[PDB]
């Protein structure tokens, strides 16, 4: 398995350490003009300033690029920062972008409000439907962006399927693939081009780093991304990398409780009089599963549930012990939400309609509390 | 009026659990008391946090420290020097727009305006903004902002950044001063007219090269505003842990200054009178064109400055033989760096605009520390006169 | 009932600021409202703090994760294992008193107890506690404190604390237990009898090997009270930073317990019918000499134990040619150690008291991680067969 | 002669994979190339480490640059000047032999000579120190040690450390002096005779209120080892994050500490001549009773000191209206502190010690910053001059 890879990655130790150190510098000194000098053109081994590249960061980036099986990584200030770069380092004016409808708000917002002022045509479209794909489709179309199970409905889309479509027309094909880790989903083993992650979440899994991380199948795509990062500036900083890199090391280990715990608390939910409908991808009945089964070798814990009222949702999440009320996932502890007043305020309401969030809806983030804890913590806030 | 050390030393907030150090928030999230409570939060309602991407306490403290200097309606502080500059920039310029920019500028920045800007559709021109007639001459109806950096890294080049500021203020443009080299002891942008002041913390700020970071400041409570709203969708973030040192070093930042400014204008001098230096490029000096505009605009100097050896082979050879002196890029630094602007911090810069900045292989750039400055002289001194 | 997975990951207490995770109090000092409000706090009188030695909220946070497993009145945390042990002995023990320890112990406990103590008038008897009545024949009228290790470092021998205990409570003993071994998830000393509950922290706590910490826990808050004076004399402090990294270490202590002891079981096993094995000491072995007791008094078991090569010459050659476990000194970590006792942490006990410990140059000690452990077989396996 | 300055800016030992910064080892163990590297580590032979507990590369560091300006032949770093005091005493002394030590002593160092030491077997009498005459009568056969903190805690108290080392150095006792009020750039007990200097490092080495940790320096390398020796079983570590924060710290202190003593001894002159003032115990005052001796063994004064009220409630007033000025324990931070001995830092201290001590509730005790002098000085003649 992924976890003895993870804490036995590659490289040298540093003077011996068992534990990576943390290179909290700014810049490196060179041994002569000489060398310097060939640092900046590429040449030699080692470091120049953080900016360009950072042992410890770059040890995380290596801990990602190998699970992931890409040729190169690249660590950022935030998922936002990665999903920036992993666009905006390839879209230019004159250029068109398909983006799955559904999406966490701030990529929305990205997509919506800034794109469009840098010349940058786009389409939020119902990606779970191949052909509506294939008909959105422009003699000027480089990209598509999807996120797989989405934020926050979990829609699924077919990652195989929309790859062949953008390899045979010539676009590039990005995946969010925050929502089920790199454990589960593996994006560039499905075709993609560049898959990425809001480290923040699961990756980390302790709730005290925002990160993002981008992993690209190409050399000169993982190099493009990197060039824009040094120009735009969203650095993982050292510090947030010795972390990432420490909670990374029981990440396939959480994954696999944060599964069974979600799918759990998802069946408890479904067979629950007060619950109208549960939308979780590892259910039999929701309508993404056969797909989400074949391309995912797992699930995360986070899933959408619809309450009967605003004020059962509003009673249900006002009243649990256990679970907390906050924005965010993937934590180790479970997190809960109300995507249309909190992550989907600010989304347009006529993209909302087409993502179908309503204040009815409730997003949990199942953690890796004893599952019987939790599920007792939401049976008394629903009955009592 | 109190002292600039004592404002860094006793800044607005409230203390928390009644810590004397102000604690770092190493969070993602936030805990909301209600569904209302969070719904507020939002909508901007009411007094908390919501995530550390929309704004964190640690992070926020430090963003206060450096609107009091420069005398700013907010700050927002980025993961390094350039994401302010991208989100400075990009927050407000789209398709369609002009941007006048020094033609001598931080290399990376040359790399944003010259490359990424243009594929976004907005016109660049790269202008010698130290003679305000070539800004004049270069404006158009489409022009929404004039970016400089004053004095220029790395050649010291100054700009009138009052007289350019009038021009911006009478057509509509924003002026954005990159204030790095010079910290906002010694300059304040939005004193001169500047719409926007921004640093590399990562230099002077900080001061004690371990950290990269980024601040930016408006004049304008709803252009911070923009700002962190392209902040929050770009992602360039200061690190709790980062805004903690950042903060931490800026707690020294007026008395450093001090002794930096003292220093520098020392080495300068020696360097000038030297045999082997053929030109000293310090704003400082009075044999320096500028000098009366940067003595006016400014209320002190850097450290960090250029000059010119007889030939690349005796700027190595100095380069090479130093003792004290560290060769290394950045700068700002509590000890001394140095190094070679033509193969290093300006390699990656469009032959063109190399030559039109004045970049040649004889040049060194050296950035003084606090060091006694005896020390440093003797150390230069001693590789001047090698065998 | 909350299980403890549960209980960890929902420490008591008010958020700060509303923050999800803990700030870390990076500060020395903290400011007073009033002199009235200073002076009260300096009393024990209201709440709050004053200067982080005295007490700091993210290593108060840490305290109470740990106090809350071991079933304590309180918990103190310190700089190291060493700090959690002298703290726990010298806050009680005086000139004229006399200790009995085990006679196996850590390699610095031993140079604690052998060179420290006496030169401070105790005197100390290290005598072997597996067997209860050797307790008993040692004790004198002077006798305050035993110290136990259960499994010892590092050859896993057991000692019988609830028996132990029964005799320190009828006899005006404290009863002090190093449980570093085992990890509080299956060992609760305070539960059998014992009045101190220790660890390093450097270990399975934190996990992660990447910080140095120690932990003490008493029944009575009186004893608590007096460790935490002795802390504020000797000043062995856990600092906030490393407060942080035990406390996020210590999330997934549950979780990570239960594969280290899987994990360390299936290598033992594998080890005890390997034909380059002479033995191998894992308490939970059916042919352990304590397995009986350790099964009763523990909940599982930690997965740091010996074994026994058949030269000087095998032993090397077995650790210098394993390419996932990693030669060196410490335990509990996520990813698998090994190491040479008799020339590393052990090294420096006197021939005396190594004899009696059976420590000798074909004894290694390994430290299972939580990688598959079928990597960890194989990388053995093909070590053995050179 | 190099200067502080510029020793402290550049340590000596190797960079860690070229970093500039030195890099924090938050790690325990270390890995061993063979058993035979490993087994040699621990003989002491070979260049290497082993595990935090024994050494550290960053609190390594650290340790070097201490004993750089001490003078040592070697320095440990520990979790508190608790820990350094300790270490620095417990180390050598055992049952049967007797201790000197100082009467005027911070808190937790009466603690731990009259509460803890006792129950050792160890012998210890509390004098006044700055008679020599005092020190010679209370000298037994057994004596081996004696320990001064001089200016003493809180009340400024001189002890001739010269005088009393040529005592020690006659009978063969060890000197201890904790400089911990002075800071090594101008009290430097090495070179007056002591054999070990040591300090609480959370006062003004690191400087930023920051972190808590000791320092002990040794004249010996016997000394220094044993020193060691005893940290190893005692557990007071110094953890590679502080080391990292102090050695941050530590690169301004020569220039926090020449604006520490100016602001010093302008506020000490200041209230010395305000009718409210009773009386100011800085031994820069030339009313200070063994100023003398203090102008004549330390190269300049920290900024901690105390002064007398006309009472309680005067006092009070003053402490509790500042605006600059933080209430709170501890010092020698780069902000200004202010503090009630009597009933914050020396509360525990028994009745007898106190009377000794010389502390009523009258005395105030300010630990003055690096902000500007005329902000502090306005401060508290405000609150001085409160209806
Ligand atoms: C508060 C944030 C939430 N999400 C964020 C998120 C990001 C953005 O990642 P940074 O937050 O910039 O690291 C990217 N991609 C996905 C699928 C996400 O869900 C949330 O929903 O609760
Ligand atoms: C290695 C870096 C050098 N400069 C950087 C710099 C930045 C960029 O700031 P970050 O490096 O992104 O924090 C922005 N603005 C100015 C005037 C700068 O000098 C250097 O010159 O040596
Ligand atoms: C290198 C250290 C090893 N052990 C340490 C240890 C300590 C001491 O704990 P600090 O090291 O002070 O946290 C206390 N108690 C026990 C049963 C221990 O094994 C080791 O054996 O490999
Ligand atoms: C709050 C602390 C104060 N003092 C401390 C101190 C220590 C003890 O050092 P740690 O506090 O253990 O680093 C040792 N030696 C001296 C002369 C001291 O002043 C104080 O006075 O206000």
């Known amino acids: ?16 350490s068992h534990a990576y150190p943390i290179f909290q510098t700014s ?17 030699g081994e080692g470091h120049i300033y953080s900016r360009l590249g950072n042992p410890t960061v ?40 398909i983006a799955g ?4 708000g701030c990529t929305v917002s990205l997509f919506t409000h800034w794109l469009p002022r840098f010349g940058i045509e786009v389409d939020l479209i119902d990606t779970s439907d191949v052909e509506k794909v294939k008909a959105a489709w422009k003699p000027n179309t480089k990209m598509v ?14 990652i195989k399927g ?11 094909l990005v995946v969010d693939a925050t929502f089920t880790s790199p454990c589960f989903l593996k994006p560039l083993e499905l075709g993609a081009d560049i898959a990425l992650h809001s480290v923040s979440k699961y990756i980390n899994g302790h709730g005290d780093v925002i990160g993002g991380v981008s992993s690209a199948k190409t050399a000169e795509d993982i190099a493009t991304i990197k060039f824009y990062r040094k120009d735009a500036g969203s650095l993982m900083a050292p510090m947030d990398a010795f972390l990432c890199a420490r909670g990374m090391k029981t990440l396939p280990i959480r994954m696999q409780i944060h599964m069974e715990n979600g799918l759990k608390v998802a069946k408890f939910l479904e067979q629950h009089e007060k619950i109208v409908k549960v939308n979780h991808p590892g259910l039999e009945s929701f309508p993404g599963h056969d797909i989400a089964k ?11 549930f619809e309450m009967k009222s605003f004020e059962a949702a509003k009673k249900l999440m006002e009243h649990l012990k256990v679970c907390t009320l906050a924005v965010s996932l993937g934590c180790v502890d479970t997190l809960i939400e109300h ?11 006529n993209i909302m309609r087409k993502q179908g969030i309503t204040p009815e809806l409730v997003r949990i983030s199942v953690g890796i509390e004893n599952v019987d804890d939790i599920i007792a913590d939401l049976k008394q806030a629903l009955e009592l």
């Open 1 to 16: 398995d992924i976890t003895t890879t993870l804490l036995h990655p590659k490289g040298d130790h540093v003077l011996h």
């Open 27 to 43: 810049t490196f000194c060179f041994d002569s003009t000489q060398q310097g000098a060939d640092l900046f053109m590429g040449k």
């Open 58 to 97: 770059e040890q995380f980036e290596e801990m990602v690029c190998s699970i992931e099986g890409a040729a190169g990584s690249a660590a950022f200030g935030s998922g936002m920062g990665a999903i920036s770069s992993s666009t905006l380092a390839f879209l230019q004016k004159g250029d068109h972008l």
């Open 101 to 104: 409808d559904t999406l966490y």
């Open 145 to 158: 962006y999807l996120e797989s199970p989405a934020n926050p409905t979990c829609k699924v889309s077919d």
């Open 162 to 172: 929309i790859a062949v479509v953008c390899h045979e027309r010539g676009a590039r």
């Open 294 to 304: 074949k391309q995912m070798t797992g699930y995360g814990s986070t899933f959408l």
């Open 339 to 349: 995507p249309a007043s909190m992550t989907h305020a600010a989304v347009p309401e």
